[PDB]
Design a protein around this ligand. Structure first.
Ligand SMILES: C[C@H](C[C@@H](C[C@H](C[C@@H](C[C@@H](CCN1CCCC1=O)N1CCCC1=O)N1CCCC1=O)N1CCCC1=O)N1CCCC1=O)N1CCCC1=O
Ligand SMILES: COc1cc(CCNC(=O)c2nc(-c3ccccc3F)[nH]c(=O)c2O)ccn1
Ligand SMILES: [Mn+2]
Ligand SMILES: [Mn+2]
Length: 185
């Protein structure tokens, strides 16, 4: 119990802000990549936020529309990706995406930003390069930006995500945690 703390204000906020299972998946995703949520608390909240947005995103639309890639361990996620590619014929993406759209026949990369959605997508579009994987960026301010202006979901489903994102921002600010969270990206 030396360099590893017993608790943090951000960690306690993450646990009361997000559903317990979302917190567990974020802990597993971080520990799989050698990161401890008890110290890097800003990344802990961001992974939780990205997880919840991904699950809300898949909750929009029909029952069998989306195959959820995020939230699984790396090996299982790449296994499902291989099955989707070897079933639909879609090219294997270089980087692990977040979802697959059975309706649109494309993988989706979900992004949640604390800057303008313009820089983030411009980053993610240049990282994945492949103009076949769909990109959908959400901001804590309420904007969004998707590939070919195709926002996939209904307006109501996307507005729910933007509303939740702004609520997380307000809850952090009332705890004086937002500025360090914003400056961490
Ligand atoms: C399948 C299972 C877990 C799922 C996680 C995901 C969570 C989903 C639950 C829904 C219902 N709602 C809505 C009301 C509250 C709630 O809970 N949502 C969406 C909103 C927040 C939330 O919680 N879903 C979707 C299918 C059913 C389910 O539970 N996951 C985890 C990653 C991959 C995946 O599909 N799995 C699979 C094996 C391990 C495990 O845990
Ligand atoms: C540093 O890299 C990782 C990766 C993992 C597991 C897989 N995570 C992603 O693939 C994935 N990650 C992120 C994100 C990463 C760090 C901070 C805030 C984020 F929002 N955004 C995505 O959009 C996104 O898809 C856990 C911790 N750190
Ligand atoms: Mn991901
Ligand atoms: Mn993502």
């Amino acid at each position: 119990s030396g360099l590893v703390p017993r608790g943090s204000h951000m960690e306690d906020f993450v646990r009361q802000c997000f559903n317990p299972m979302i917190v567990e998946l974020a802990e597993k995703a971080m520990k799989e990549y050698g990161e401890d949520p008890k110290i890097e608390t800003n990344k802990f909240a961001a992974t939780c936020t990205h997880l919840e947005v991904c699950f809300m995103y898949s909750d929009g639309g029909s029952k069998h529309r989306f195959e959820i890639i995020e939230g699984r361990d790396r090996i299982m996620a790449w296994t499902v990706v291989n099955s989707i590619c070897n079933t639909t014929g879609v090219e294997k993406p270089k980087f692990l995406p977040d979802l697959y759209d059975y309706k649109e026949n494309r993988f989706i990369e979900i992004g949640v930003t604390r800057r303008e959605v313009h820089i983030y997508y411009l980053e993610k579009a240049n990282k994945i390069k492949s103009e076949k994987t769909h990109i959908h960026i959400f901001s804590f301010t309420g904007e969004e930006m998707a590939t070919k202006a195709d926002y996939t979901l209904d307006e109501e489903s996307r507005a729910r995500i933007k509303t939740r994102l702004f609520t997380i921002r307000q809850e952090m600010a009332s705890r004086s945690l937002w500025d360090s969270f914003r400056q961490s990206e």
